[PDB]
Amino acid sequence: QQPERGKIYDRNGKVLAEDVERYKLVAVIDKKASANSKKPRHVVDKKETAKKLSTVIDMKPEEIEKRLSQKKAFQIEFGRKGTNLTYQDKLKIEKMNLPGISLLPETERFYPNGNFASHLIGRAQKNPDTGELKGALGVEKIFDSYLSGKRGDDVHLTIDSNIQVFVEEALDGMVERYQPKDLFAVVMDAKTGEILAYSQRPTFNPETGKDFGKKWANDLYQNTYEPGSTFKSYGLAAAIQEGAFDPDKKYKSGHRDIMGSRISDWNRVGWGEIPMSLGFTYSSNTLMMHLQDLVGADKMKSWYERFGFGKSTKGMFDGEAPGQIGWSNELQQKTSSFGQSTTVTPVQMLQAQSAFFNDGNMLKPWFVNSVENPVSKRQFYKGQKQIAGKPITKDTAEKVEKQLDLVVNSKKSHAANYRIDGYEVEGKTGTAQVAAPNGGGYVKGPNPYFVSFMGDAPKKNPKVIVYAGMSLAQKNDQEAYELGVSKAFKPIMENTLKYLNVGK
Amino acid sequence: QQPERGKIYDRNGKVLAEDVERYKLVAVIDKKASANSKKPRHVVDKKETAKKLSTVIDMKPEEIEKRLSQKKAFQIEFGRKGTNLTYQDKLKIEKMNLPGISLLPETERFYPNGNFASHLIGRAQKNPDTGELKGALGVEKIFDSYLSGKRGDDVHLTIDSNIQVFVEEALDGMVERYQPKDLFAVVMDAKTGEILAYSQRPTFNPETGKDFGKKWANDLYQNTYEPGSTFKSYGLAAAIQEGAFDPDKKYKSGHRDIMGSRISDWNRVGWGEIPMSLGFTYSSNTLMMHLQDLVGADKMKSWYERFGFGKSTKGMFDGEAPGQIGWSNELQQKTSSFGQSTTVTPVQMLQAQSAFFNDGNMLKPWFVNSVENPVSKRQFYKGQKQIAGKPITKDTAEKVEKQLDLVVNSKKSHAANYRIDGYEVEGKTGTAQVAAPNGGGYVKGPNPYFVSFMGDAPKKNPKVIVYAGMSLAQKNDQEAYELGVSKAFKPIMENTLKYLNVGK
């Protein structure tokens, strides 16, 4: 028969996916089966058999009888409700001692946590003819040649199921409240790059197949976003190191005219001549345009490239999107400074953000801990911390971190809804416009925003980074604009900090 | 945003897959949208709107009214029923001039023939956030990087849509009649290895997604079979070339005792001492075991290996199965001589069978004619005839072909139901036992057979090879044993021979 497909484990050894034995119900209905035998080998009483079978399977007795009455057939099955039956279901049916009724063992792929990190783990599909399982998405697909067999190798993830629960629960909350078109959250260990939790909405249920195929793209590695103002931190880091950002230097706020278009601070008028530090706390768009002018267009492109953007991070997911740095003209360049036109993956954002908490060294994020075989003990692969690049100095990092502290904790902050009681939080907010897939423009509406937060806690020396974004709320779009992802970040961040024994 | 994904063509240039424009229905329901305008820009009459809208979309107005009556919402959409709407559907709705009602264009992937070579062409899935299309099976998947974009490249197949119809129609016939667990048919140009038509059952509908994912395996390249007595031709080819098969020399029919198991000819008793040609006409199992004894176990293993079995043919389908030559012991070796224990892909059988019609040269089967871009005119790839290997001599091929002629047309033939009026037909039959997917035995039952025919016509100098197999008929399983796949081979072969202008 088939070799046992390897298991997918979480960082603490909990099974995320495995092979189990289930059972399919089979009924011989042709009288010829009992010709030679003393006790009947087929269904004599269709009515009683159907009545009694409906006590285990989710079928009405008239339907079982209908299927039981098909002609020119030796055996019948009962569709979706005849299979994936439990060992308990088997025993119930066998005690019934129904003639012609049997249960046939079948291998199924079992996901013990159901809808749980689904767009990461993936789904294995079965070929009924041979029972052969073949991964169709995520880890099951990426690592299909190892997982398959004699027994396949196991794949151990960096995911912590305890932190994953916090994420899953938070995302359910977001959907209920905001019904967004797309949504994701990811928790990364701030010192190693390990992905401790990831999920997205909408997603699917690996165990039932529900909604599988409706959205093939994994948001972390394969989808791309105009990030919005969370992108401002890398412009700021560049400005700091080049000697263009002085936190106390004043600058002319208000607007800039770019190729005949008005790019304004979010209040249209600005605040007059204000210190550069305050403008970042306000998320002043003119600040970033001004800083770009200081550093230089050519230099700013290299800066964004040296932060990893526009190229794949080379993770172990299939089809990793590279994004692109929008630099074709001044309008694209100026809008890229606050995170429009340029497109990114969430994994790129995690990689760049990590520079500020590792003396300027970007960490390559990673989610595969081990591929190894449990019978032979052969280890094929082992994940590890890896520096993707050191684009800034330690001094620049600390100076970036000070403005991220002020974004949340300045008296003039517009991000106090992201604060958590007992825990010092910092990060950067984003409210970004999202391109219409057909239409060549931005999606229109009262608040047609991709709202996001790139946060970390405890501030200065964080244990985890939390990045969460929500695209185009369809319910409560006013609150989505006012609160961003704060109703996701707080329950994720707080519960993780508690589980990791960080002190309040 | 997205480039146009390239097209999939048939050998004569008919579109099998392309990008089209469809439509999604959008209803603004907030009064603020019509606040500034004189005529309402939102849905004022929800009841009338819902009643009228249900004349186009598959939704009952009681449900439409509920969705139109959601709070904290500006716009609403209508799920799966609100999208993939046609231009005809669009004009109808716009004729209603319902307030707040709009149509938004979306790119969809269109398969003009619906359920048509579906397990070869495949299906591309859409990521709603960006509209980006991604092949999930078949040619759409294999050639996704070429089809994707700026405009994607085209993929031209060797399939002839005209012959495909014959196959599609015959396979529908078999299902209705026999309800098999598995079924496939394939037409190959006998002199080039081109795949002119292929299909399987059950399958899916690329255009709607119906039943997609239910069975991932492509029967031609990815599924494996104990072929049964169609495998005998390669044993015969070996014996001929080794000097062990003489058509007129007699042999002891009846049975052989192999490792304590009695393996008999299909009528249990045999026919006494009969000539070897007649035994092949009868599909005598003991003949093949006797021939194996003559040639030698080791030599016979090289023979099946040199006919290509046990290794992938190195085609351009993903995850091509290798099969295996079942040789662990005498019982496995001896049953392999009549096509059990050993497993194969249909593509291997086609490759080996072509030897008999090309002076012994095996042809590599192939189905991709061209990958090229219609804007730049760059050709990335062009398919061609290729000799997989010449395992036998011209003389041995001719001698095999003579026994395949007698299999169908001897006065003592047991295969006359495969004859076609006006056309000289030849081939080899198979009635094989099928291994239990979970368990250690063969599927049990009245006629638990994988029945097949490996045929070609016109005989001796055929224009096409037709291979068809049917696994485990659930309806009319007795007739399946008596007629094999003849109710599929005859209409496929006859309609193709006529379409190809072969004279009756």
Ligand SMILES: *C(=O)[C@@H](NC(=O)[C@H](N)c1ccccc1)[C@H]1NC(C(=O)O)=C(C)CS1
């Ligand atoms: C950064 O993301 C920046 N976004 C914008 O300038 C867009 N165009 C915008 C969206 C809504 C209202 C005004 C402008 C903004 N940064 C933030 C933030 O930090 O969340 C906000 C709220 C507006 S300015």
Ligand SMILES: *C(=O)[C@@H](NC(=O)[C@H](N)c1ccccc1)[C@H]1NC(C(=O)O)=C(C)CS1
């Ligand atoms: C070849 O396929 C061969 N098959 C068998 O010997 C199996 N074990 C069998 C199945 C049904 C009945 C008897 C034996 C047979 N070849 C053929 C044929 O050419 O189709 C038949 C019908 C029986 S012997």
